[PDB]
Symmetry: C5
Amino acid sequence: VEVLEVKTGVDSITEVECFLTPEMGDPDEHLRGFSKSISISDTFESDSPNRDMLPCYSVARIPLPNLILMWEAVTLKTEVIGVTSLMNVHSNGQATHDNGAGKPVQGTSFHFFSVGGEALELQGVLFNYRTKYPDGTIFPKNATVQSQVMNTEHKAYLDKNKAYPVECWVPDPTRNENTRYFGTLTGGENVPPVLHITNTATTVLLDEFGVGPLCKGDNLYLSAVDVCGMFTNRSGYQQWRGLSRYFKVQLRKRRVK
Amino acid sequence: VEVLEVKTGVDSITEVECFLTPEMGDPDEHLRGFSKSISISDTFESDSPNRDMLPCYSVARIPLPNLILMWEAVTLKTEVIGVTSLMNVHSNGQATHDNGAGKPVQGTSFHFFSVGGEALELQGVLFNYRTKYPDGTIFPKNATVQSQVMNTEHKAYLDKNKAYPVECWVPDPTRNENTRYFGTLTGGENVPPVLHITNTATTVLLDEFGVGPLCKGDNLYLSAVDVCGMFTNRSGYQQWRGLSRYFKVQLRKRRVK
Amino acid sequence: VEVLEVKTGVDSITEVECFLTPEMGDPDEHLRGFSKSISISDTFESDSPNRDMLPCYSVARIPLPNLNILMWEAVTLKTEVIGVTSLMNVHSNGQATHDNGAGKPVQGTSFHFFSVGGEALELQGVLFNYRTKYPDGTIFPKNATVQSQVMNTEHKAYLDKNKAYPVECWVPDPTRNENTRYFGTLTGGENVPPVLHITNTATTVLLDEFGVGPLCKGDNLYLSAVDVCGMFTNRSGYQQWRGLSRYFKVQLRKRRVK
Amino acid sequence: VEVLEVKTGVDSITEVECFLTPEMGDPDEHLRGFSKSISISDTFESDSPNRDMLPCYSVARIPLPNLILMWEAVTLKTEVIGVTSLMNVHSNGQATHDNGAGKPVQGTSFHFFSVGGEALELQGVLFNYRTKYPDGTIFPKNATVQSQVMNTEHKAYLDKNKAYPVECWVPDPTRNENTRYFGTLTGGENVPPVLHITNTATTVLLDEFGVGPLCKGDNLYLSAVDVCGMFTNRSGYQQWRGLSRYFKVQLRKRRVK
Amino acid sequence: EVLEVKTGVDSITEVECFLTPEMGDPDEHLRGFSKSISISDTFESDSPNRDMLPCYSVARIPLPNLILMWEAVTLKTEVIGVTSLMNVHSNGQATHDNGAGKPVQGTSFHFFSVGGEALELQGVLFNYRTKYPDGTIFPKNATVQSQVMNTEHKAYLDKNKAYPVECWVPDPTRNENTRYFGTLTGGENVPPVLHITNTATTVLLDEFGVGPLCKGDNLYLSAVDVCGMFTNRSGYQQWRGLSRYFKVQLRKRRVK
């Protein structure tokens, strides 16, 4: 694909605005946004996580106005929605000490977002290659011990919700030329969430050539993970807690040959 | 609104200077700036926080000189007032160890401020959709399990003091075009307050087009939350502690069509 | 004050260099730089801290060469905390971190603050607990009410005396201080580690958005500081604030005003 | 060699893309990416770590198109592969409290990468000069007590994979004129991993004279260490855990005398 | 008076070297470590042994014989041997049952200076009644005012293994001809955070474009790199230090 000039005129720009809800596992009708309580297998060999215990990547395919011209994604505004909810330290929590408030959501977090002109490309990496992934999830197949470091057989597209567990897939750095992705994993059982909100921050999506993601077949792909940490119940059982992510993307028409 | 030229001359500028007091709950006549001690529900179903246990958003609607021209907010200086009061570790606190000083205010904090030409627009997000919020508060209504992640029915305006609880409302990123907002949630029961003060820092409120918040009906809206963390008393009970926030806003007259 | 041109020539510039010592309470003849051990009241209403237990703001009023009305304008500042390495003494009546271990170093809540102005720093009182009874010899918010816990505009003062204004009840008043530049950081928490940077290569410019620095009324420069580094914990677990001196070097130039 | 002009035009640029797998010790057929559990010696004199307990530097030598012209390395994109695998807190782990999730990978980390026109040059520094290093590793020889601080006899080239223990060797700052290297050691038993991923960040490899690494013999040398921390099993045994590193390097032909 | 920079081939030189740490070296096997730290019963009985006190390191480097003076312009510097702190298998105290050894952690001081003369020091004491040992150079005639500021305590960093870190800091009222940088990170659980790269340069020129000017053709390099404490199996703790690399570029400058 050869990239030519940007179109101008009022008609030449468009915006997409939406939110992606988290997919933390939702273990019952009351627990949307939470995983099932986390349990620990006795050995690597016996690791067989329940589906509702595994957070998944979120994805949305957004149809754009029908258009050779392509929509080019230029800027992104994004934020995590509902950061203050984590101030509820009075709901079935475990007191930090005698008479204390509830232990807040804390521990390992993964905050990730991407904007692309096609589905996010994934590479599988397993903590433990013998983990048995549950029916209903899409996971690295034919895993070997090399899957614990790098097995190039594990290639996928983020093309379905509630399907791709966070713990076994990452953005494939060898691909994704037509996507911009950003993530941070903060590990450790006591790490505190640090969540910033503002409507004043824009990320520019253009590459070093001044070209943003180009939307193949007039579709924009948005992906997210916002595992904020773990909620600890009074019993001490812990569940992942996630929040939704807002996206606002500006796009312009670009001619290509 | 189509935006035209800025008015110049001596008459063309004005200043708003004020402070917003925190609304932490004020459980008795000696505890302005604190919440009621936090207690924890037995279950998710039975979460029923009392009003004096819930910090709320602060808001001031400031009338501007009567003026088609509109006042445009251009710059902000802001500061948390009384940061050193958190050095009082000698006042019914809980000794950190035998013979030690009192445990200082620490734990989950939310520091938030916004400047707008109209009320801050809020989206509701609930940690637990089954929480019964108390009489005298304004809270997400007709909550469903989906309210734990994103229920678009929960839209409100920050239009009343000591009413909108921090934990169930955030700025609505889908709206707020005429407001600039900034916030940080730092979670974890042991996080240290880190509070900077200076009279040398200015925030510019202009958007990417060089336009600040435009004050409809000649009112400026200022909003804040400064939950600094929790105070732990001698018996281990914990209360939110908040502080006031200073605002100084420079405004100029702007013609609109 | 209408601010006119800057004077030039050899005679037109001057320097102020000094250190301000901390005022932590100094409970005896051997404990300069420390507070008395901290004790805790059993109720808010019985919080009666002793004077030697309360860190205070430090202030220095520095006479400048005597001076159409010309005023000395403060333009740049170099500053740093003096004696940072002293906190490496972990062998001196400290509480061992664990069996056979070294002494716990100074740590916990810090307040690091400095200001340069052409008049006394202006203060606003805010109280953690309005019923705290501050001791004789300190200058404290008077006629305190429960509103003093968040904002009571009656509590206005000038930082105009050393060893007198307790840190915990006063802050720079953001509604005033047009003729001062101030900078402070509170880091709270009992386990917080001191992070103290030193260098002779860092300068802070004191000019405001209009290119004007503090103008020294009556040819006096006002320097203020607090450097509570944390608490020292002794063998028995008693804790005392520990403070350090602060170095100031300020460059000034002559400025005509109308 | 005098460095002359860059060649421009059709085949004057080339690109190298690969991943380096971690060499953490791999104590059995199921544990690629992990070390053997760490044992502690009784005294300094008796320190004798087994080969499979010692992470090693990784290196790859990449042949470039055959070319006086030399390939010049100009830019690097790099990232750690499989960051999300650290969210597996459900297998063979040690609960962080009664009924809690498993303790995530945490503690001492070393993240390091280099790009050069020849092998990374190493200087040996030993924590304990009396450590008996195992057969099959390449370590500072003829160690003396000075080796604990600086013994200039300890020079090596990172010229073999799975051979040079991380704890024995650092990049030699007195050499490496023709390499760019970057590393961070984060110590402490409880430090949280903080791992950022993005395809939008580039490192420029040019020195202050605008010259990048020049590839002798048309070979590019890539080196890495990514010890992310330690995994703790149910019984408290701890093992280093490493992850692969992606490299994409852009190169240009440079004329030299 | 500082005049113009000399140019041409012969007008630049570079200095490269390492400074070894001076942590106390309590025996023939423990270079880079202090003696185990012990704690006095009271302030008035504080009497640290020599081998328990880390000291400032200093090197005076002779430059090519040259009024011209060598001017130090840039610096590249890093801590050498950062990865050695990954030895958690050597007589350490297990973090928990069956765990690895606790790594080096706790209070650190990382400091370096480049000057055209000895670094000037000001003394400040944690406890003025500390009895400092024979073989160290320490603030003399100490009073309670030495705990905050006693201008009597002035010295030059003119000897290795002599000036204890805890007694002395760079004197900010002097050092016109030196550039110095240091960070104290306190607290007993503080994790070392150590960066290495050959791509970072510090410019030594002041606001007037003038770097340290080397009196008598000597360059002065000083360092402290106390990385933290190593805890042994029995809980005893010792300071651990590491060497520091310096690369300095100098140019000939005419002075009056």
